[PDB]
Write an enzyme that holds these catalytic residues in place. Sequence first.
Site, short mmCIF file in Angstrom:
data_model
loop_
_atom_site.label_atom_id
_atom_site.label_comp_id
_atom_site.label_asym_id
_atom_site.label_seq_id
_atom_site.Cartn_x
_atom_site.Cartn_y
_atom_site.Cartn_z
N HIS B 166 0.73 -1.42 0.08
CA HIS B 166 -0.19 0.05 -0.05
C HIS B 166 0.80 1.36 -0.02
CE1 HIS B 166 -2.96 3.14 0.96
NE2 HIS B 166 -3.92 2.41 0.27
N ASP B 319 -8.17 4.08 3.24
CA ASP B 319 -7.89 4.14 1.74
C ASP B 319 -8.32 2.74 1.38
OD1 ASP B 319 -5.85 4.44 -1.00
OD2 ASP B 319 -7.70 5.56 -0.71
#
EC number: 4.98.1.1
Lengths: 359, 359
Positions: B166, B319
């Site tokens: 990520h 997110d």
Amino acid sequence: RKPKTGILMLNHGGPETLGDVHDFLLRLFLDRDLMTLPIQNKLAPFIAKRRTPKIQEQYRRIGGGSPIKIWTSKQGEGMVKLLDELSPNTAPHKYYIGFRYVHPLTEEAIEEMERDGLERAIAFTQYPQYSCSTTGSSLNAIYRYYNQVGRKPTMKWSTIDRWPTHHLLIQCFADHILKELDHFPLEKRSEVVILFSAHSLPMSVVNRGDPYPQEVSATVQKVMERLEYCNPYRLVWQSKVGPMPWLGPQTDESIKGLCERGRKNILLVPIAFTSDHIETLYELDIEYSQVLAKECGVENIRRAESLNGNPLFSKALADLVHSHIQSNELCSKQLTLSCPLCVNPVCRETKSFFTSQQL
Amino acid sequence: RKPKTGILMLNHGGPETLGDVHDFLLRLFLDRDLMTLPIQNKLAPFIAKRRTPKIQEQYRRIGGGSPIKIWTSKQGEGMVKLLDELSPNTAPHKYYIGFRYVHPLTEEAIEEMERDGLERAIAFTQYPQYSCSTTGSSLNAIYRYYNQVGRKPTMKWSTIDRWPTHHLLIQCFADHILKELDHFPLEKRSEVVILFSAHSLPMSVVNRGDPYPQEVSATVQKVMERLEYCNPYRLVWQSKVGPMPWLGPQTDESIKGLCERGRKNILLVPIAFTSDHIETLYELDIEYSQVLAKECGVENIRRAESLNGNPLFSKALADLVHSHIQSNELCSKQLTLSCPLCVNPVCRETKSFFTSQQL
Ligand code: HEM
Ligand code: HEM
Ligand SMILES: C[C@H](CCC(=O)O)[C@H]1CC[C@H]2[C@@H]3[C@H](O)C[C@@H]4C[C@H](O)CC[C@]4(C)[C@H]3C[C@H](O)[C@]12C
Ligand SMILES: C[C@H](CCC(=O)O)[C@H]1CC[C@H]2[C@@H]3[C@H](O)C[C@@H]4C[C@H](O)CC[C@]4(C)[C@H]3C[C@H](O)[C@]12C
Ligand SMILES: C[C@H](CCC(=O)O)[C@H]1CC[C@H]2[C@@H]3[C@H](O)C[C@@H]4C[C@H](O)CC[C@]4(C)[C@H]3C[C@H](O)[C@]12C
Ligand SMILES: C[C@H](CCC(=O)O)[C@H]1CC[C@H]2[C@@H]3[C@H](O)C[C@@H]4C[C@H](O)CC[C@]4(C)[C@H]3C[C@H](O)[C@]12C
Ligand code: FES
Ligand code: FES
Ligand SMILES: [Cl-]
Ligand SMILES: [Cl-]
């Protein structure tokens, strides 16, 4: 006209005929850098004489020798052709082949390089992911040469000692994966399990701090990112020999294992080599995908195609040299750190040689 | 109003106070997903009673307990604050902690989430890199919960089962590493060696196809890429316990080695966890930096701060959840492949539990 910049392409031997198998093994068993045995000069000549028939037999099984030189050569030419256009300041570029354990040996290449009166020499490992037992052994040979010859280099040197995530390297792997997937029965595509297969290392090396696994592992992630995780994968290691512990899982066991669990569509991707050689044509294609795969009842097993003649890989090589030259880099940052556990004095000297280089 | 979407945050957890130690070890030792003990049901309560003193002792040296819960809490809140804004469609979101070996147990969190009639539940591993012994065990507990209570879930389940690369996770690590370099003597910045350190695994686990090491290696690369290879590094493994072989090199061993070879400026980077705990505050700060580093005469050793409260970590979490929702995903592609050699009949059950979910 006179060759200005020299690209030394480094790689392990591959005997080109069954005849070269003996000297291949002998040079292999003599490298301190890759193994310390008792009274080495005495054992090696014998171990080689002993394992020659079986290796011969393996090479005969794939047609009678290694294609490593043929592929390096063509990849070489391609590289040169492109470099001569993208980097014209570096005059004509020449490629040389420095194989560790077969002719042209690294030493011979260096002799030829000196004599062509090059301005700059570049050590370009053909191993994208750095191991001491591979790229390091090749780098050591360059240093030792100059310290055996007694004189010292008349050309300035530098190394491209790793490149495990170069963007075009990744694109090549993905392309070859995509197209190998298209030959799988369309009904089975989504269900193909991808095994990235790398040459294993002994734990005693892994535990010493060799960077290899972590680099291979990066290569694998980049590839799968580009593929957008279209299939599940694992990273597995092949070519273990001997009774000691090596990094697993073993590729032979994973294939066997996957099968028993009903995953019978398998794509092997040899992720740590840039061309075919014994590891793919014998180990993977014959031992694994033909004998092993068969007696476990695989449905389909395919092997993604080695980068071999791909023109894009040839661009990859050129793009790396070009960048290396422009950046004025002597080696990667990673080279400037030895593994926190080598017992080997030459590792520091060899890295000195590259970081101490003029210009 | 009532909570629409629940975000189950899975972690091992740790004893909050010294009194929880016994119960913590008990549940570790009864977990037939990392331990087959002869008459396990009888050894375990005992092994617990025996190890309790020393582990209590360790926790005492760090202030008397684990912060995993405080930090998970703070991350939880921030995550929710953002997610309510990012995805108003998914109504109010609520987080739950489901620790594996301490209260609130996975199973308690599940009872609670179901009691608030959520439309959906997201199992959100807090281990960015997947291991069968970490995220897997946490996932096994959810599946096992229903099998035990003998009912079906009243909410639609899915999972974020891994996230080693990520972009915001990576960014936080980069930031924290940079912040730590400015704390080193300026004359030594670019001589600092970065040792990414991760919980080790027994070879017997590595060797059955555990995804973790390759994922940890991936995380490392992305961080170094974004750092632009500003300092040499190695990836090393901590927390080996026992006579068996683990994946090395060991963090401690590596530090000592580096010191014996003149690399006396080390930055530890805890790359496989999202907040402080025993591994970092005792093993890294105390055992290795304060003691070992003196006996081997280090100049400077330092540790990149755990992600803990970083506001950007919270954004990272949101997110992930938000993208997971937008994407309609049940799990990673990678979860759909059990590791080629497991012998655990449950992994496929768990997996099926997530791949099979309605909506
Ligand atoms: C210390 C680490 C390593 C050791 C100890 C080692 C050992 C050996 C041995 C014993 C052989 C002879 C093969 C046999 O007789 O069965 C061999 C050959 C070979 N090695 Fe390595 N190896 C290492 C690392 C690597 C790696 C990572 C590669 C990656 C390509 C590699 C490339 C090769 C190739 C292509 C051969 C051909 C051998 C044959 O044809 O039988 N080596 N090595
Ligand atoms: C089979 C795999 C694993 C086994 C068998 C194992 C073994 C153990 C043992 C024995 C303990 C208690 C400490 C002790 O008794 O000395 C422990 C606790 C713990 N585990 Fe693991 N470990 C494994 C994997 C992991 C991994 C990969 C992580 C994180 C990535 C992790 C996180 C922790 C933490 C934070 C503790 C607290 C230890 C303490 O407070 O003493 N475990 N595990
Ligand atoms: C493969 C070969 C056995 C030949 C045979 O009898 O067929 C054995 C003999 C000596 C071995 C090497 C030596 O044991 C020295 C090294 C020691 C390390 O612990 C393992 C790798 C190590 C580099 C070995 C690789 C390989 O297993 C060798 C080369
Ligand atoms: C223990 C020692 C390795 C020592 C070291 O790594 O420093 C081992 C590894 C490889 C071994 C040798 C190689 O396997 C080649 C020979 C093969 C025979 O089967 C045994 C004797 C033989 C001559 C071995 C003697 C001894 O057992 C060696 C030399
Ligand atoms: C052989 C067995 C490991 C079983 C396995 O492979 O899972 C080992 C691992 C942990 C051991 C036990 C635990 O360490 C606790 C005890 C500690 C003492 O040092 C020995 C007896 C003791 C009661 C051990 C007996 C036995 O040797 C055990 C049970
Ligand atoms: C920590 C404890 C030893 C304490 C003691 O006897 O004082 C022992 C008892 C059982 C052990 C475990 C068991 O042998 C089973 C696991 C199997 C792996 O091969 C080693 C890790 C593994 C998880 C062991 C780690 C550790 O040594 C344990 C947890
Ligand atoms: S063996 Fe890796 S640097 Fe010396
Ligand atoms: S142990 Fe990895 S899936 Fe069963
Ligand atoms: Cl070959
Ligand atoms: Cl903790």
